[PDB]
């Protein structure tokens, strides 16, 4: 009920943020580039990642509202690497439609990302920060946008090979997701605080937070239900995507479990797909990854503690709660 | 001979870009992110555009040392675009290599492009100048930035019809080249000199040297003998590339004309593509196309009259000079 609320709240403050991306990126000459733009953007996405930065800074000081162009830049960065990733992943239709390199080809998607990244600095460049705090917020999306590209390229030499390490998957989400969760939090405090104690515990949350997202996003992919999910489970399994639950797996398990998963993994299928999070289950690999999860969820709110008692610390808990809450 | 000289100021200068460039990117983990980002870097470019910063911020005001990251900014920047557009326009090998893509895939080479963009940006945060300064370099980067993706859009429609206008291929270019080679300019003097007379100065002489060059390399690309071009003339023909001989062409020539190149533009073929350049030259559309880059070098340096005399305002004219004489 409260999450209610809290959706409330989180879609309130989207409104000034969607107003900002939208006037960085307005129909205007060239429209096919800057609606290939656009159409991530115009999915109505939740903008989860601005709200931990304005929310951020109010857990601090206050007054969110100059930290506005920063959480635009974040947003900016967030859409322009699902545009790339989606080019990468061959990903057919993010949400209910078509995916940007789909509709306009692959070359105008990358020149979309592009132009995406390009204005998270443009934003980045219009806040109303002190130069320090400015020099400082702009180090900071640079550290974490590298950190991305990082990321996404370990994620591409996984394809180069069948099996992955607890280590090797922690270490690439880390700075696929984390990095840029972990940055809207560290750039929200920033913005309103020269406490670094705060800092340093709004920057762990949203690591934390970030990569226990993922992980539950994969556990809910294997063992949501079908109809609630509004599809069936195990397509992770189907594309053989290294989460930390086939990391979990292929260090436990021996090699006739090992190689008969390897066949049906990534490769009627009912029966194939059920066998291999049989395998799963076999070596507690689902329920590994799910404690994970909340274990990180537990450590990034029990970091928060620090900070004073507000309703922005609260939803900041809230969120990090129904992040693994959900279904 | 003074060319060989300014070849050796140049030169000179590259070396200090060099060692700021990669220790940006160095060769560590992920490596085969960071050699493929590093590889067109390693071409050993001769780096126009940085030397362009530099010797901008000693025609206003002197130490040019102080445009040491910002110049870097704009060399990765431009790096990051030659790997996104080759993966668009199909090129196989830059220089005597083969391309990026070719070499670690289009997904990787859309990454490196993507860190190299990244870095570009960590290089402005890296730079050592007063806030007020920094903030005003920031945002010419970024319109810069802006502006490419821009016009490389336009270019990519282009390819969705057979014939363009003269006014269409100039707005493209504009933004392609002009921009970047404008803001190195324009930068160059933000860096030494609050004089907003020669900044204007600077940046006309860099926006109009930036289009001239390309004018000027398609000019050759089809007049140039091969021996000293290295290949026959005219596979911008065979190509079917927009440029500005092209536009004049369509805009000048009679139906019969225009129908027969279309049939031989972009498609033994030594035959066809003399008949294509004999078509063009018909109504004087390589001269036209010499002449305007020759004009808009004359008047880029009448444009550096404004500034004082020094050997590197003599560079900028020398070069400005060279970049339309060589062959
Ligand atoms: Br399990
Ligand atoms: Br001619
Ligand atoms: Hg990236
Ligand atoms: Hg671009």
Redesign the pocket.
């Known amino acids: 009920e409260k999450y209610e609320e809290l959706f409330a709240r989180i879609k309130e403050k989207a409104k000034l943020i969607d107003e900002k991306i939208f006037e960085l990126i307005p129909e205007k000459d060239p429209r096919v580039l800057y609606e290939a733009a656009r159409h991530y953007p115009l999915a109505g996405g939740k903008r989860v990642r601005p709200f931990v930065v304005l929310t951020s800074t109010e857990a601090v000081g206050g007054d969110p509202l100059r930290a506005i162009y920063p959480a635009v830049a974040i947003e900016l960065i967030h859409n322009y690497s699902l545009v790339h990733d989606d080019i990468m992943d061959m990903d057919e239709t993010r949400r209910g439609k078509p995916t940007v390199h789909r509709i306009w080809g692959v070359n105008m998607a990358i020149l979309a990302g592009d132009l995406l990244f390009s204005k998270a600095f443009e934003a980045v460049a219009r806040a109303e920060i002190p130069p320090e705090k400015k020099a400082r917020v702009l180090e900071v999306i640079v550290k974490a946008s590298n950190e991305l590209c990082e990321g996404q390229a370990r994620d591409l030499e996984f394809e180069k090979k069948s099996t992955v390490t607890i280590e090797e998957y922690m270490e690439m989400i880390s700075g696929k997701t984390g990095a840029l969760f972990e940055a809207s939090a560290k750039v929200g405090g920033i913005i309103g605080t020269d406490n670094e104690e705060y800092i340093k515990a709004l920057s762990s949350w949203g690591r934390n937070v970030g990569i226990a997202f993922q992980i539950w996003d994969d556990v809910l992919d294997l063992?949501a239900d079908e109809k609630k999910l509004g599809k069936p489970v195990g397509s992770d399994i189907r594309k053989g995507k290294k989460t930390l639950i086939v990391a979990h797996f292929f260090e436990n398990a021996d090699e006739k479990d090992k190689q008969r998963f390897l066949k049906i993994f990534g490769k009627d299928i009912k029966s194939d797909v059920m066998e291999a999070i049989d395998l799963?289950?076999?070596?507690?690999?689902?329920?590994?990854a799910?404690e994970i999860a909340k274990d990180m969820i537990k450590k990034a709110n029990e970091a928060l503690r620090i900070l004073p008692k507000s309703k922005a610390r609260m939803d900041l808990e809230l969120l990090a709660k129904f992040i693994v809450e959900r279904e």
Do not use: E, N, T
């Open positions: 063992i799963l289950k076999k070596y507690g690999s689902i329920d590994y799910a």
